[PDB]
Amino acid sequence: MSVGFIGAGQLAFALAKGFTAAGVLAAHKIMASSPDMDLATVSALRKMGVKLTPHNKETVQHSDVLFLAVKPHIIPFILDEIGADIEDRHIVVSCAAGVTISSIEKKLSAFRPAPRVIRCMTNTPVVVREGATVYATGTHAQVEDGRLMEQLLSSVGFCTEVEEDLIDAVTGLSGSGPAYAFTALDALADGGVKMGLPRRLAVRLGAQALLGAAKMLLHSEQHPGQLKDNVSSPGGATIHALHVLESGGFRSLLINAVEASCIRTRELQSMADQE
Amino acid sequence: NLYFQSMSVGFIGAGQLAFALAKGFTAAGVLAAHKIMASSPDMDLATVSALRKMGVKLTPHNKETVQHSDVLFLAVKPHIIPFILDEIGADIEDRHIVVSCAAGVTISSIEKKLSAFRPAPRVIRCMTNTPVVVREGATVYATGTHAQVEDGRLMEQLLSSVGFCTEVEEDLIDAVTGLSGSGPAYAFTALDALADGGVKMGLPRRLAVRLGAQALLGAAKMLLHSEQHPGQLKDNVSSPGGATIHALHVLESGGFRSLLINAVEASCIRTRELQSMADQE
Amino acid sequence: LYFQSMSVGFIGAGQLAFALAKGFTAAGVLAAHKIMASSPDMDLATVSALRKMGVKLTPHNKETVQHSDVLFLAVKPHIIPFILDEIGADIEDRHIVVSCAAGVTISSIEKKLSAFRPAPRVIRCMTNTPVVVREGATVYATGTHAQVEDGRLMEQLLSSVGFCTEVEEDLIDAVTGLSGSGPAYAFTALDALADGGVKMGLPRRLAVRLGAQALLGAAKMLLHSEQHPGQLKDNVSSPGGATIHALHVLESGGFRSLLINAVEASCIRTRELQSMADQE
Amino acid sequence: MSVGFIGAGQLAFALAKGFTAAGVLAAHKIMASSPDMDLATVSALRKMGVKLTPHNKETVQHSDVLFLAVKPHIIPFILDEIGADIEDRHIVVSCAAGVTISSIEKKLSAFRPAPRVIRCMTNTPVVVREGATVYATGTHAQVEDGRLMEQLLSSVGFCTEVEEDLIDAVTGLSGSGPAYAFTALDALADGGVKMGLPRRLAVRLGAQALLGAAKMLLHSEQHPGQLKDNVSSPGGATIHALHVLESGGFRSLLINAVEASCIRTRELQSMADQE
Amino acid sequence: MSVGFIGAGQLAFALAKGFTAAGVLAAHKIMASSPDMDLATVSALRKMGVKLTPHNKETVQHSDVLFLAVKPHIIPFILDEIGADIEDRHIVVSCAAGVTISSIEKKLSAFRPAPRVIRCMTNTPVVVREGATVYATGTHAQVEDGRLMEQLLSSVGFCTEVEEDLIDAVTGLSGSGPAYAFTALDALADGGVKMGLPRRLAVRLGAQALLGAAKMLLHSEQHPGQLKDNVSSPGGATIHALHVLESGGFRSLLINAVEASCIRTRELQSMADQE
Ligand SMILES: NC(=O)C1=CN([C@@H]2O[C@H](COP(=O)(O)OP(=O)(O)OC[C@H]3O[C@@H](n4cnc5c(N)ncnc54)[C@H](O)[C@@H]3O)[C@@H](O)[C@H]2O)C=CC1
Ligand SMILES: NC(=O)C1=CN([C@@H]2O[C@H](COP(=O)(O)OP(=O)(O)OC[C@H]3O[C@@H](n4cnc5c(N)ncnc54)[C@H](O)[C@@H]3O)[C@@H](O)[C@H]2O)C=CC1
Ligand SMILES: NC(=O)C1=CN([C@@H]2O[C@H](COP(=O)(O)OP(=O)(O)OC[C@H]3O[C@@H](n4cnc5c(N)ncnc54)[C@H](O)[C@@H]3O)[C@@H](O)[C@H]2O)C=CC1
Ligand SMILES: NC(=O)C1=CN([C@@H]2O[C@H](COP(=O)(O)OP(=O)(O)OC[C@H]3O[C@@H](n4cnc5c(N)ncnc54)[C@H](O)[C@@H]3O)[C@@H](O)[C@H]2O)C=CC1
Ligand SMILES: NC(=O)C1=CN([C@@H]2O[C@H](COP(=O)(O)OP(=O)(O)OC[C@H]3O[C@@H](n4cnc5c(N)ncnc54)[C@H](O)[C@@H]3O)[C@@H](O)[C@H]2O)C=CC1
């Protein structure tokens, strides 16, 4: 099976890294393309054995499954450029935030009737095979196409099919989510350092606690509030810390965040659609 | 692996921590369940029924656990430790490794109590967390005055089977308690609230819970395997003008970073305060 | 359930004495005429109420102690010392003394009473006014000399007007902050919620009724469910819906921390008051 | 009398469980329909004894009283599905938040001329027979229809007739109301645990306190301020706790919540009334 | 001239880097010592040509000027260990935060009368020869000693003699100062990225603006408020941004910071002195 990436940045490197680390794709059967063939993501991809090229045309003619891995606003430019080269064998998987199946199918249908389009939202932890991924199938996506997508992306993390009208919300939760965790971990490390731990130890312990707590949840039947109960003993240290999180409106900040990321994703797509 | 060949473990107290550690210990295969004994006064309890299903030997007699164990974990609340040490103290023999898990409780307080019986108790203090139950714990430990060199080697091997383990000087353990001991509760509050956000934006609760937990899992895993500063990694995720940099701004406008600093601090300070009040009495 | 030869007496004839007596008679386990209350303000509003029930009223605490087998101390906490000095020589071996006072410890009660006769039988309880509708939340702790049959009797009596359970005494100040003061948080919340309903177009009477019915049913759901309150809150909030929007404005205000602050302030104040009674 | 539910989720389970606990209705005189059968609520209603079917038409033909228990945006889809199947004998009770009698009649009136519609607002504590219900009768609902609906819903809690223009306000007060109570109970338990109580005992005592206070109010002639006065003695623990609530603006948060819920209810019906 | 560093961490590397970059000391005439002879600061120092060693004894016997570059609490341990090796040729320059001349002279005078002690406060930008440095001379510091110190440290940044009772305040301002600037620069970069700049460009421009504004001030006669006036035109963009800094209490946060750093430095030295 032949894979290609339009655009070779953070997202394309993470995906090729996980795919090849999962063992489901050889690196030499993967090609990516970028105009700036001297990006540091281009270097990492070439060290990894991926075929690199500046011409978007060679990538499409190489691959069956084609990931669009450029920024949202470049997508119209990308699609006008390769639209004429989309054979019937292709599955076009769009990764860009907010870009709708409708808009991709409209641009590509001007060239070939019935382009096969899958929209996915992912995140950078696919690079360690722990990404969170949802996808939606376009009008002309065959049933097997959605099964190939799910098999492929389940090798690098969690995957499930969703209705397209959830994906902007997913983008704000698990698309932006790693950036919230990274911010939280830097602060928790700061807390550790304040109380006397060396930086390196504080980072390791915070990340390890974040990891174990999430895994606990994923493997537990129970509610996040219930697992929290089990950690905090009456009068003890944890319940005291939880009180200071509550007094600052900790929960509402996280809600504000997911909301802000989602709304901004919708807002960007209105300006894309208006234009 | 001969460290675990004939080794017997006991837990004084059979609650959340005993079950988490026994659950990870048995799931790791380092110990068979029947080689483990847990004791508690309220036998018919929530966690003591899980431990019996695993195959752990249970008993209401703290002394039976002492007679059974090579390594004896103290899995009771901190204020019970002196009450427990007075009880089984005359039973701790030279062959024992006493491992205190209680938050705050110093190696000094345990050694002072136990040395009024046999002169050289081998005491190790640890701080761990519940994710050892899925073998992803965060554990540190400090060896006491009489803890032999191999004693720390065995303790590290035992607790590394259920997660990260490293030795520390004792005076850090209270700050570790505020960071990784209380850590999981911070993550569960965060995950609950991310899901509320997901739900507010139109996601089913089940999907929002799965997705936020997977997102925290993957991000923490990325950090542990990366050679790079948590700031660089967030820089990689936020593209110019994008959804993510917008969401990071509302986190900054609420003082998100400082709330987690307050939290680690409040936990560490409460841990010290509880131990200074126990030291008074 | 009816304990024939059980005479009950109340020192103090106010809010709590009225609430306990109304619950006890409504439950039918005590006829009103086998109950006696005493107060110096025989022209109080709750004294009027208890006499309409048929409860035997009297101004003399000695008359209450001599009538009673179980004796409720339902006076302000600073009054408990003076009361125990007035009646302590009238205490007999047959009495079970139940103190209702916030924060006043069993130790303090026994030290005062044992100056008069050894081995007084003391139980400390924390309750709340909803016993008046038989939905109280009560805990109790037995003293040094209470017989095991005394706590079982107190528990039987008090279970008939709400939830009742034995606790260790050192939990009672925190229970005071949770369920003793707790009805007052509910009343403040129901007044506010009704205000919200009036703001959005509801008549005041309707808003009060619906608000109270919603708190009552949610509480009943939790008591009869196995599940976490968070889990029941997940069940009521649908994606993007009206409820998750409201929960967000609650979270932005630190709603949860305010109720932790409240329980904490009530408990600390309770300890503080006793800790300076112990100084006097 | 036969009862049907279009949509077999949280509300249908709550009403079915309450009606049969009340004994007004035999489980097997209840029928519910849902496309997504693998739902948790379908498994719960099955064991109750309710008849389950994927076809909304079978529910309509079974029912004398037909509850509309789908998400508010599904309502227009549903009324077009079974509109031809509504007969003269039906009483159509809409349980959807925000959806007006006007919009329901307009859809249904295109088929049979005189649809008997009732709008109701309820909440999940019907499942323990302590719900709070209001209802408005539509244009063709006869006097006997309102009486029958009142009788049915009074068996699972409080029920009264309102003008329809109140029901959006009711939704924010008593419809969303249980969720405010669950948040408060969880936080009240956290405070109990902070001060030394076991979680189980603190959950139990907080819920019992809210239950007794609410019942006290419902059985009282008195303003909630007066009851509050009765609990707080001079200098005492309660009046100190009420000060820290007042200092956080506790009352305004609850007003904010009711208002935010009511606004959202109106906003969604504006979106429906445009689409 | 012979220099030695007790402790080879961030501070010792920065100083040796600037000194050798200034051209006033050859790297091979510099020796440092550390127990953890495998620190990454140890590696940088060895790549640089400094003599490394684990024994604190060899450093003292190598150097004339001896910097104490360990953490404050290690200083008593350090001084008890080498006190007996302090010849009369040595100048002991203590860099540790908060540690007083008094306490160093007391420990060292137990071995040799009249130890020559200079207390300095510095910061990490000495590594690019732009540090801010103050020093105070001890009781037995000869006049030339203070002149050797000032000449040495003026080659790697600003230097001036102060009374010792200012140094804790200096520690909070220019000792901790670089950490405030680094925090500010990360946030300004975030602001740039929010408004559409690539990360790399936003960091470069912020740092360049921070640098030019400081240099402007250092070379200007005028008051920081006056230079601010000259930047903001009536109604323009700058004065708008300055208003949002004022509304959040920007200035007071910076005052809080310097204060917090200073008080904590005093507080640590009381516990050192008490112990
Ligand atoms: N970084 C993240 O956290 C994730 C990013 N995404 C999405 O993936 C897309 C890119 O993500 P990043 O990898 O952060 O982008 P990036 O900014 O790292 O680099 C994107 C690549 O596209 C290349 N490119 C630009 N114009 C091109 C053209 N005309 N033809 C071919 N290649 C071109 C750029 O040179 C660069 O190599 C965005 O739409 C983003 O929403 C989604 C999931 C996670
Ligand atoms: N749960 C957590 O998240 C962690 C807890 N810890 C520490 O572990 C200890 C207990 O942790 P949890 O298990 O959370 O408490 P827990 O209360 O779930 O278990 C306590 C156990 O001690 C038993 N116990 C009480 N008195 C006893 C006695 N006299 N003899 C024997 N057993 C007795 C209780 O019956 C109960 O089984 C505490 O000191 C806590 O600080 C430390 C790390 C993680
Ligand atoms: N009111 C409440 O919500 C609850 C009350 N309590 C406790 O119950 C006790 C009383 O509470 P309330 O009944 O609300 O007080 P209250 O002030 O309504 O009535 C107190 C009674 O004590 C009587 N009294 C004063 N001096 C007396 C004396 N020397 N001899 C006999 N009677 C005397 C007064 O006349 C008054 O009738 C307090 O200790 C309080 O902590 C505990 C739980 C809830
Ligand atoms: N959950 C609550 O707390 C309360 C809910 N409500 C209202 O009740 C309605 C539903 O409430 P929930 O039951 O919580 O929603 P829910 O999502 O639990 O159940 C919705 C049901 O509709 C079914 N459904 C979806 N499309 C359908 C279709 N085309 N034909 C037939 N059935 C279909 C789904 O399978 C699901 O079972 C909403 O409009 C809400 O406003 C009002 C009072 C309280
Ligand atoms: N990093 C900064 O921003 C500045 C630090 N300082 C001061 O300089 C001192 C250290 O600063 P950092 O370089 O941040 O320390 P650091 O933590 O980078 O490393 C200090 C060095 O001391 C070594 N060391 C520990 N015990 C030792 C011993 N017994 N004998 C010899 N070496 C030993 C450590 O192994 C490490 O190499 C502190 O007192 C600090 O206040 C002052 C100016 C700026």
Residue C105 structure tokens: 């410890």
For helices C106-114 and C80-87, angle between their N-to-C axes, nearest 10 degrees: 30
Total residue length of chain E: 275
- DSSP H or E run through C165: strand C162-166
* Residue of C252, C267, C268 to mutate, testing the A interface (most A Cβ within 10 Å of its Cβ): C252
**What is d(CA A242, CA D194) in angstroms, rounded to the nearest whole number?**
9
Q: Look at residues C234, E107, C261, E63 and name the one whose alpha carbon lies nearest to residue B200.
A: C234
Q: Tell me the β-bridge partners of E63.
A: none
* Nearest CB to A243; choose among D186, D194, D198: D194
Q: Is C61 in the pocket of ligand 3 (CB under 6 A)?
A: yes
Beta strands in chain E, from DSSP E residues, in sequence order:
3-6, 30-33, 51-53, 65-68, 91-94, 117-121, 131-137, 157-161
Residue A266 structure tokens: 């919708």
**How far does residue C148's CA lie from ligand 2's centre (Å)?**
29
- Strand pairing report for A3-6 and A65-68: parallel
Q: Is A269 in the pocket of ligand 1 (CB under 6 A)?
A: no
**How far does residue C179's CA lie from ligand 3's centre (Å)?**
17
Is E156 within 8 Å of E131 (Cβ atoms)? Answer: yes
- Strand pairing report for C136-142 and C122-126: antiparallel
Contact A242 D190 (CB under 8 A): yes
E48's CB contacts (< 8 A; 6+ apart) are E13, E16, E17, E20, E27
**How far does residue B143's CA lie from ligand 5's centre (Å)?**
26
* Nearest CB to A243; choose among C228, C234, C257: C257
Q: Is B76 in the pocket of ligand 2 (CB under 6 A)?
A: yes
Q: Look at residues D230, D116, B109 and name the one whose alpha carbon lies nearest to residue C128.
A: D230
User: Which atom of ligand 2 is closest in space to residue B105's alpha carbon?
Assistant: 39
CB atoms within 10 A of CB E240: 10
Coarse DSSP helix, strand, coil percentages of chain B, rounded to the nearest 5 percent: 60, 15, 25
Q: Look at residues B237, B188, E198 and name the one whose alpha carbon lies nearest to residue A180.
A: B237
- Interface A-C: count of C-beta contacts within 8 A: 40
**How far does residue C51's CA lie from ligand 3's centre (Å)?**
17
Is A35 within 8 Å of A54 (Cβ atoms)? Answer: yes
A21 known ligand binder? no
Q: Look at residues E106, E103, E55, E101 and name the one whose alpha carbon lies nearest to residue E82.
A: E55
Q: Tell me the β-bridge partners of C138.
A: C164
Q: Is D133 in the pocket of ligand 4 (CB under 6 A)?
A: no
Residue B132 structure tokens: 């050892």
**What is d(CA C125, CA E248) in angstroms, rounded to the nearest whole number?**
50
**What is d(CA E65, CA E116) in angstroms, rounded to the nearest whole number?**
10
Q: What is the DSSP string of A110-145?
A: TTSSS--EEEEE--GGGGGT-EEEEEEE-TT--HHH
**How far does residue D198's CA lie from ligand 4's centre (Å)?**
36
**CA dist D146 → D29, D63, D100, D142 (Å):** 21, 17, 17, 7
**What is d(CA C260, CA D25) in angstroms, rounded to the nearest whole number?**
43
- Burial tier of A29 (Cβ tally within 10 Å: 0-12, 13-18, 19+): middle
Q: Which ligand is nearest to the CA of C78?
A: 3
**What is d(CA D242, CA C188) in angstroms, rounded to the nearest whole number?**
8
Q: Look at residues A274, D265, D247 and name the one whose alpha carbon lies nearest to residue C240.
A: D265
Question: For chain C, which residues lie within 8 Å of any Cβ of chain A, measuring from their own Cβ?
Answer: 227-231, 234, 248, 251-254, 256-257, 260-261
**What is d(CA E12, CA E7) in angstroms, rounded to the nearest whole number?**
7
Instruction: Provide the CA B236 distance to its chain's centre, in angstroms.
Output: 32
Coil vs helix vs strand at C72: strand
Is A97 within 8 Å of A175 (Cβ atoms)? Answer: yes
Coil vs helix vs strand at C13: coil
Is B143 within 8 Å of B156 (Cβ atoms)? Answer: no
Q: Which residue has the tokens 């020559």?
A: E116
A259's CB contacts (< 8 A; 6+ apart) are A172, B197, B200, B201
Q: Look at residues A128, A164, A110, A146 and name the one whose alpha carbon lies nearest to residue A19.
A: A128
Q: Look at residues B267, E54, D13 and name the one whose alpha carbon lies nearest to residue A197.
A: B267
Residue C91, phi then psi, degrees to nearest 5: -65, 135
Largest Cα span, chain D = 68
Residue A237 half-sphere exposure toward CB, CA atoms < 13 A: 33
Task: For a ligand 3 pocket test, name from C10, C11, C15, C64 the mutation site with the most ligand atoms within 8 angstroms of its C-beta.
Answer: C15
* Torsion on CA atoms E234, E235, E239, E244, rounded to nearest 10: 160
**What is d(CA B187, CA A215) in angstroms, rounded to the nearest whole number?**
11
**What is d(CA B175, CA B157) in angstroms, rounded to the nearest whole number?**
23
**CA dist A110 → A77, A86, E254, E273 (Å):** 14, 11, 59, 81
Partners of residue B248 in chain A, C-beta under 8 Å = 179-180, 183, 257
CB atoms within 10 A of CB C115: 13
Residue C129 structure tokens: 């006014």
Is A228 within 8 Å of A246 (Cβ atoms)? Answer: no
Q: Which residue of C has its CA nearest to A235?
A: C174
Is C159 within 8 Å of C135 (Cβ atoms)? Answer: no
Neighbours of chain C (3+ CB pairs under 8 A): A, B, D
Beta strands in C13-117, from DSSP E residues, in sequence order:
35-38, 56-58, 70-73, 96-99
**What is d(CA C121, CA C8) in angstroms, rounded to the nearest whole number?**
15
Q: Look at residues E174, A145, E135, D191 and name the one whose alpha carbon lies nearest to residue C259.
A: D191
User: How far does E144 lie from chain B, in Å, by closest CA?
Assistant: 43
Is D168 within 8 Å of D261 (Cβ atoms)? Answer: no
**How far does residue E95's CA lie from ligand 5's centre (Å)?**
9
**What is d(CA D101, CA D136) in angstroms, rounded to the nearest whole number?**
8
**How far does residue E10's CA lie from ligand 5's centre (Å)?**
7
**What is d(CA A64, CA E21) in angstroms, rounded to the nearest whole number?**
56
Coil vs helix vs strand at E213: helix
Partners of residue A262 in chain C, C-beta under 8 Å = none
Partners of residue C139 in chain D, C-beta under 8 Å = 205
Residue B56 structure tokens: 């752990």
Provide the H-helix boundaries in C160-203.
Answer: 172-175, 182-199
Coil vs helix vs strand at A99: coil
Residue E116, phi then psi, degrees to nearest 5: -95, 110
Contact C261 D244 (CB under 8 A): yes
Question: For chain B, which residues lie within 8 Å of any Cβ of chain E, measuring from their own Cβ?
Answer: 231, 235, 238, 240-241, 245-246, 248-249, 252
Contact B199 C230 (CB under 8 A): no
Partners of residue D199 in chain A, C-beta under 8 Å = 229, 234
* Nearest CB to C231; choose among A223, A246, A248: A223
Contact C254 A246 (CB under 8 A): yes
Q: Which ligand is nearest to the CA of E52?
A: 5
Is A33 within 8 Å of A5 (Cβ atoms)? Answer: yes
Is A45 within 8 Å of A10 (Cβ atoms)? Answer: no
What burial letters (b/e) apply to C43-52, b meaning 16+ CB within 10 Å? ebebbebbee
Q: Which ligand is nearest to the CA of A43?
A: 1
**CA dist D228 → A166, C216, D216 (Å):** 46, 17, 11
Region at C28 (left for phi over 0; alpha for psi -120 to 50; beta for the rest):
left
Three-state helix/strand/coil letters over chain D: CCEEEECCCHHHHHHHHHHHHHCCCCHHHEEEECCCCCCHHHHHHHHHCCEEECCHHHHHHHCCEEEECCCCCHHHHHHHHHHHHCCCCCEEEECCCCCCHHHHHHHHHCCCCCCCEEEEECCHHHHHCCEEEEEEECCCCCHHHHHHHHHHHHCCEEEEECCHHHHHHHHHHHHCHHHHHHHHHHHHHHHHHHCCCCHHHHHHHHHHHHHHHHHHHHCCCCCHHHHHHHHCCCCCHHHHHHHHHHHCCHHHHHHHHHHHHHHHHHHHHHHHHHC
Touch between C and A (at least 3 CB pairs under 8 Å): yes
- Strand pairing report for E30-33 and E3-6: parallel
Q: Is C100 in the pocket of ligand 3 (CB under 6 A)?
A: yes
Contact D258 C197 (CB under 8 A): yes
Q: Look at residues A111, A68, A114 and name the one whose alpha carbon lies nearest to residue A89.
A: A114
Residue B95, phi then psi, degrees to nearest 5: -75, 0
For helices C242-252 and D177-194, angle between their N-to-C axes, nearest 10 degrees: 30
Experimental determination technique: X-ray
Is B31 within 8 Å of B139 (Cβ atoms)? Answer: no
Residue E261 half-sphere exposure toward CB, CA atoms < 13 A: 20
**What is d(CA A190, CA A209) in angstroms, rounded to the nearest whole number?**
15
* Residue of D201, D229, D254 to mutate, testing the C interface (most C Cβ within 10 Å of its Cβ): D254
Q: Look at residues E65, E52, E266 and name the one whose alpha carbon lies nearest to residue E171.
A: E266
Q: Dihedral sign for Cα A250, A256, A262, A265, please.
A: negative
E110's CB contacts (< 8 A; 6+ apart) are E83
Nearest C-alpha to atom 36 of ligand 1 is from which residue? A9
CB atoms within 10 A of CB B18: 27
Breaks (C-N over 2.5 A) in chain B follow: none
Q: Which ligand is nearest to the CA of E54?
A: 5
Beta strands in chain B, from DSSP E residues, in sequence order:
9-12, 36-39, 57-59, 71-74, 97-100, 122-127, 137-143, 163-167
User: Which atom of ligand 1 is closest in space to residue A36's alpha carbon?
Assistant: 35
Q: Dihedral sign for Cα D172, D175, D177, D180, please.
A: negative
**What is d(CA E147, CA E161) in angstroms, rounded to the nearest whole number?**
10
Is C38 within 8 Å of C59 (Cβ atoms)? Answer: yes
Q: Is B128 in the pocket of ligand 2 (CB under 6 A)?
A: yes
CB atoms within 10 A of CB A79: 24
**What is d(CA C146, CA C152) in angstroms, rounded to the nearest whole number?**
10
Q: Tell me the β-bridge partners of E52.
A: E32
Q: Dihedral sign for Cα A234, A236, A242, A246, please.
A: positive
Is A145 within 8 Å of A91 (Cβ atoms)? Answer: yes
Breaks (C-N over 2.5 A) in chain A follow: none
Residue type, E41: T
**What is d(CA A212, CA C242) in angstroms, rounded to the nearest whole number?**
34
- Strand pairing report for E117-121 and E131-137: antiparallel
Residue E249 structure tokens: 């209490």
Q: Which residue of B has its CA nearest to C233?
A: B196
**CA dist A171 → B14, B28, B144, E23 (Å):** 43, 36, 50, 54
B102 known ligand binder? yes
Is E206 within 8 Å of E183 (Cβ atoms)? Answer: no
Q: Which residue of D has its CA nearest to C166?
A: D201
Is D177 within 8 Å of C211 (Cβ atoms)? Answer: yes
**CA dist D2 → B259, D25, D28, D75, D122 (Å):** 55, 8, 9, 21, 20
**What is d(CA D266, CA D102) in angstroms, rounded to the nearest whole number?**
14
B192 DSSP assignment: H
* Nearest CB to B264; choose among A132, A188, A231: A188
CB atoms within 10 A of CB C60: 11
- Burial tier of C95 (Cβ tally within 10 Å: 0-12, 13-18, 19+): buried
**CA dist B200 → A135, A260, B112, B245 (Å):** 20, 11, 55, 20
**What is d(CA E47, CA C175) in angstroms, rounded to the nearest whole number?**
66
